[PDB]
Design a protein around this ligand. Structure first.
Ligand SMILES: CC1=C(/C=C/C(C)=C/C=C/C(C)=C/C(=O)O)C(C)(C)CCC1
Ligand SMILES: *[C@@H]1O[C@H](CO)[C@@H](O)[C@H](O)[C@H]1NC(C)=O
Ligand SMILES: *[C@@H]1O[C@H](CO)[C@@H](O)[C@H](O)[C@H]1NC(C)=O
Ligand SMILES: *[C@@H]1O[C@H](CO)[C@@H](O)[C@H](O)[C@H]1NC(C)=O
Ligand SMILES: *[C@@H]1O[C@H](CO)[C@@H](O)[C@H](O)[C@H]1NC(C)=O
Ligand SMILES: *[C@@H]1O[C@H](CO)[C@@H](O)[C@H](O)[C@H]1NC(C)=O
Ligand SMILES: *[C@@H]1O[C@H](CO)[C@@H](O)[C@H](O)[C@H]1NC(C)=O
Ligand SMILES: *[C@@H]1O[C@H](CO)[C@@H](O)[C@H](O)[C@H]1NC(C)=O
Ligand SMILES: *[C@@H]1O[C@H](CO)[C@@H](O)[C@H](O)[C@H]1NC(C)=O
Lengths: 29, 48, 469, 193, 48
């Protein structure tokens, strides 16, 4: 984990979050 | 997969399962309880 | 003089025995933790519980002897029940309960924690120390003992612990979280002010023959059919799309009025899926029919004999639904093409009715009018008598927009409808945006139940304190 | 005008309806019969209403005047021996009741046999049928209490409608057979379990 | 239906419209004369 970023996410854990990706309201109703 | 199965669970509220219609309020506002019930029951057995 | 109810209440509901079962019964009981009105003042579903000075009690809708009154009085071991100071019922500190036409029984000896258990059905047929009480519909889970005595029961709306106990059908809930589950009226009908030609389509001096049955559209009418059963006596009325009782609550997109005169022994043939020289060669009703059928005797007027009525009798092909056919090419039952000759195996298509005042019932003319229509489609013209209230503008309502019912909050809309466009259906084919039938504006419907409660609790043994989520 | 202003039958009805012609007796014309015709509210199930406050179809409160847009509620039948079938009086009697609840008074003609006291029987206690062995009971009923229903809401203990005693029902099918067998090719001998 | 006028006709196994499309293995013709207020009793499961 890096000190610069506010969270303790490492330089490879973030490459995974930004790679894995109304109706949901209708399901809620 | 878990967002495709749950979308079918919502798509399947548009099927009337052989009843008069697929909107419960329609059936309730077109039929008296003696005949409304025998249609609601083929809805309640279709969604369950 | 309010006082807090402690543990009293629950009564043996029904006549069926149960032992060592945690049965749940949905009936009206006495609430726990409720307000009894203790009355000691000596110097007008309901409940009741009380030297035996008070005997009886009186009720009615207005109590002015214009309508039905009701007097019930008790005695040492006797009662008298009448409609007066049309039914003459006569029979044979301390809490002798006179528990509530549904009265109860079984009295038994502020209030401590004892948990007693209470229990003739008196017909009326009409409209309607010293302690008191009341009953409202609130579920109760009774704990039948090993001998049939109600030893424990739980209110089912009192505390969050009570709801969790109902959910688990148990008296002991363990540590954890449990996922228990979690207005006015608007009527809007279109701006139609005029009635429909009741006295033009039902009492016309002459109706058309069957084979050339007339047809008439009706539009922009508020049809109050109550004004109709004062004059005529209808011998048949069977609606085939909608239950007859609700005929004054909807709106009918298009309506037609087919009229003709068949014999008495044929009126049964006007129905989806039957055969006969009326359902094959004159007038066929479609299988997916929606409409009502009306028929009454008319021998008073359509009789002399009366030979002004015809019916098609010979044809090689059955009619399709709603298929008028008028022609005079005589029928060819044989081989040669008879050119007008009503000779061998070739006859005229049309024949007549010998209607006569002497004809037996079944040979008498029967006027028939069928009214086909279609329900809850978008544009509606003819509607029911009922009035219209005003919009509530963002409060939860059981609206009745133009026939269809529905619950929800009626917020303002911005849906860019076509000027042609009326109803918005959602992904699940459930309506959510509507056009006001009077202001021609757009409203949005938001159903509101807002579920998802949970009951954080330590072990009910450990304590009672619970936290809702 | 019979199912709205005179006599409404409930939707969850249970009963029988009887009606026959009566033109032989209830005819002269006979004007001794009335029916309510004008009202602003439909009746609820089984709701007798007798009153003579004339109906107000308009604006003014007509105080007895059978004038404009305000008429009398009740009208009469012009029953006549000359009336065509359909205008003839029809006596009607409906018989409402309720089935297989605990206390029963009116029953059918059929007779009664004697108890068998612990043999399997197709009993017919007070309407309800049922199979089983009728053993003796010790169920401490209330003197008010008649029928014992089980956890699965199936009756098991009954009160005799004549001796006022208590009987217990034990259904008997006693299942669970099994057939130990070597290969039918190998032999035929088999053993039951 | 050129000569007589039938006051009741209710088929109980087959829909009336299709009566000219099938073949009927054995057929019987029971005939009798009852009063008018009894013709309803000729139906499966009634008393009188
Ligand atoms: C085809 C056929 C049958 C019915 C035919 C009948 C008896 C005709 C009824 C005509 C009506 C019903 C006309 C009317 O109402 O005027 C059945 C299957 C019974 C057996 C014999 C062959
Ligand atoms: C009951 O009486 C008390 C007064 O003791 C009062 O505060 C309360 O509002 C009343 N109603 C209920 C539902 O408790
Ligand atoms: C109550 O009973 C007593 C005798 O038991 C009798 O004298 C009295 O008239 C009764 N009161 C009634 C019937 O109102
Ligand atoms: C049930 O009855 C037995 C027999 O008298 C008695 O010993 C027992 O205490 C009773 N229990 C209850 C809960 O009534
Ligand atoms: C139809 O005309 C007859 C004859 O005048 C009349 O008695 C009846 O009230 C009329 N029907 C209506 C609905 O006006
Ligand atoms: C409908 O009638 C109401 C009351 O008479 C009126 O306020 C409204 O403007 C009318 N709407 C239309 C479209 O005529
Ligand atoms: C119930 O609680 C008491 C005191 O809080 C404790 O002594 C007892 O062991 C507990 N029993 C169970 C089954 O939780
Ligand atoms: C019922 O009738 C039988 C035969 O007459 C008789 O033996 C029995 O005692 C009667 N029971 C009652 C409760 O009257
Ligand atoms: C059947 O049994 C015979 C003699 O017991 C044996 O020779 C044969 O192999 C068996 N075959 C099978 C298929 O079991």
């Amino acid at each position: 984990p890096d000190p610069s970023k506010p969270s303790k996410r490492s330089f490879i854990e973030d490459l995974l979050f930004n790679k894995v990706t109304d109706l949901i309201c209708a399901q809620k109703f | 997969q878990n967002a495709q199965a749950l979308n079918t669970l919502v798509k399947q509220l548009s099927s009337n399962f052989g009843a008069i219609s697929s909107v419960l309020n329609d059936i309730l506002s077109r039929l008296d309880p003696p005949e409304a019930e025998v249609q609601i029951d083929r809805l309640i057995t279709g969604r369950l | 003089a309010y006082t807090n109810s402690f543990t009293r209440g629950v009564y043996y509901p029904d006549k069926v025995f149960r032992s060592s079962v945690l049965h749940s019964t949905q009936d009206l009981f006495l609430p726990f933790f409720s307000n009894v009105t203790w009355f000691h003042a000596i110097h007008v579903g309901v409940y009741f519980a009380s030297s035996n000075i008070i005997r009886g009690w009186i009720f009615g809708t207005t109590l002015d002897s214009k309508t039905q009154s009701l007097l019930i009085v008790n005695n040492a071991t006797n009662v008298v029940i009448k409609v007066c100071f049309t039914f003459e019922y006569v029979s044979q500190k301390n809490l002798r309960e006179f528990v509530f036409f549904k009265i109860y029984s079984k009295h038994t000896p502020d209030l401590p924690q004892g948990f007693s258990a209470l229990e003739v059905d008196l017909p009326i047929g009409i409209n309607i120390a010293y302690y008191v009480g009341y009953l409202q519909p609130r579920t109760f889970l009774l704990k039948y003992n090993e001998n049939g005595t109600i030893t424990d029961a739980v209110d089912c709306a009192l505390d969050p612990l009570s709801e969790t106990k109902c959910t688990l059908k148990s008296f002991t809930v363990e540590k954890g979280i449990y996922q228990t589950s979690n207005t006015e009226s608007i009527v809007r009908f279109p701006n139609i002010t005029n009635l429909c030609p009741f006295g033009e389509v039902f009492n016309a001096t002459r109706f058309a023959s069957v084979y050339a049955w007339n047809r008439k559209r009706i539009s922009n009418c508020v049809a109050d059919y109550s004004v109709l059963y004062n004059s005529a006596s209808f011998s048949t009325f069977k609606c085939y799309g909608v239950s007859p009782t609700k005929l004054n609550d909807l709106c009918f997109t298009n309506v037609y009025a087919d009229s003709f005169v068949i014999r008495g022994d044929e009126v049964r043939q006007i129905a989806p899926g039957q055969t006969g020289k009326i359902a094959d060669y004159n007038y066929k009703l479609p299988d997916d029919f929606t409409g009502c059928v009306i028929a009454w005797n008319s021998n008073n007027l359509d009789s002399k004999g009366n030979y002004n009525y015809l019916y098609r009798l010979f044809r090689k092909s059955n009619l399709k639904p709603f298929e008028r056919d008028i022609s005079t090419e005589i029928y060819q039952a044989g081989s040669t093409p008879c050119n007008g000759v009503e000779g061998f195996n070739c006859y005229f298509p049309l024949q007549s009715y010998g209607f006569q005042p002497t004809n037996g019932v079944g040979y008498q003319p029967y006027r028939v009018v069928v009214l086909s229509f279609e329900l809850l489609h978008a544009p509606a013209t003819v509607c029911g008598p009922k009035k219209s209230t005003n919009l509530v503008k963002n409060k939860c309502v059981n609206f009745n927009f133009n026939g269809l019912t529905g619950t929800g909050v009626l917020t303002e809309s911005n849906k860019k409808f076509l000027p042609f466009q009326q109803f918005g259906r959602d992904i699940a084919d459930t309506t959510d945006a509507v056009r006001d039938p009077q202001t021609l504006e757009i409203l949005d419907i938001t159903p509101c139940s807002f579920g998802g409660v949970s009951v954080i609790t330590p072990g009910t043994n450990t304590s009672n304190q619970v936290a809702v989520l």
